[PDB]
Design a binder for this molecule. Structure first.
Ligand code: HHA
Ligand code: HHA
Lengths: 158, 157
């Protein structure tokens, strides 16, 4: 049904989708300004780490400082195979993608890093309020030359 | 109010019900969870230590896998379940927690908890592809397996 309230929802979803697309295509020196897509109190970061706790980055200014580090440590990073998922909530989207690039972490040799990612994007007033990234930390261990722990799964059917 | 979109709303509603049933399946009912799949449907773990999926292919193999899983995770429950519909009536995502004892051959009994994302794709009102994404490090911890620590020098705070 075509009501002003359904129209408002569609418009919000369309606006927010464009912001998700811009985020996922932001590369190179543009990464230094990605934070501008966030609310002033917006949070971003990595939810899947070896410690089990997230690396949450709180606030638009912190996000921008993080991006200086990110560009140093992942200097040519690109997201590919981007699939955007709208949800029943006009302010909530999911993205499934791949990413690849050099990894340059101090204390490890330079490597090439590939991973599979899910990202969650929640909006408020057309800006991102919360972004979360989910990946397999084991693939990051491999890129850094760190031995990956192995689980045996005896009797697992074949 | 068109018959195509009416088809779609119906398909998405039916499919949502199957995603709910899946996520609420516990205990011995786990042995029959594979009946929610197409005959050729695929399920499994997409975040493994090998970096390749452990994909289980076919309704019969899925039911076999469930015997094993019931042994290794005897009291498993999903909680905090959030279901996401998408623009595709045949594609859903779920974010949830899961916890239970972990009883694997050759590791001490543990208590396992993790955060999950599940992907559910449908065909003909049944699951064609289920994929689970989690943090393998939390499973290593549960089993007493040492987890290395990535150093991020210079990471701002
Ligand atoms: N946070 C991502 C980063 C980024 O641009 O956000 C670059 C490379 C890898 C990290 O997963
Ligand atoms: N595949 C899950 C299994 C299940 O019910 O599918 C139980 C416990 C842990 C595994 O993530």
């Amino acid at each position: 049904e075509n009501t002003s309230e359904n129209r408002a929802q569609v418009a919000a979803r369309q606006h927010n989708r464009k912001i998700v697309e811009q985020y996922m295509h932001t590369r190179g020196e543009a990464r230094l300004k990605r934070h501008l897509l966030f609310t002033e109190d917006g949070v971003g970061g990595l939810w899947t780490t070896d410690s089990g706790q997230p690396i949450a980055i709180r606030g638009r200014e912190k996000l921008g400082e993080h991006a200086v580090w990110s560009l140093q440590c992942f200097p040519d990073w690109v997201w590919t195979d981007i699939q955007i998922f709208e949800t029943q909530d006009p302010n909530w989207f999911w993205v499934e993608c791949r990413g690849e690039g050099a990894i340059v972490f101090p204390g490890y040799p330079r490597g090439q890093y590939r991973n599979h990612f899910l990202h969650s994007f929640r909006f408020e007033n057309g800006l991102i309020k919360e972004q979360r990234e989910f990946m397999n930390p084991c693939e990051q261990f491999r890129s850094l030359g760190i031995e990956v722990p192995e689980v045996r799964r005896d009797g697992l059917p074949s």
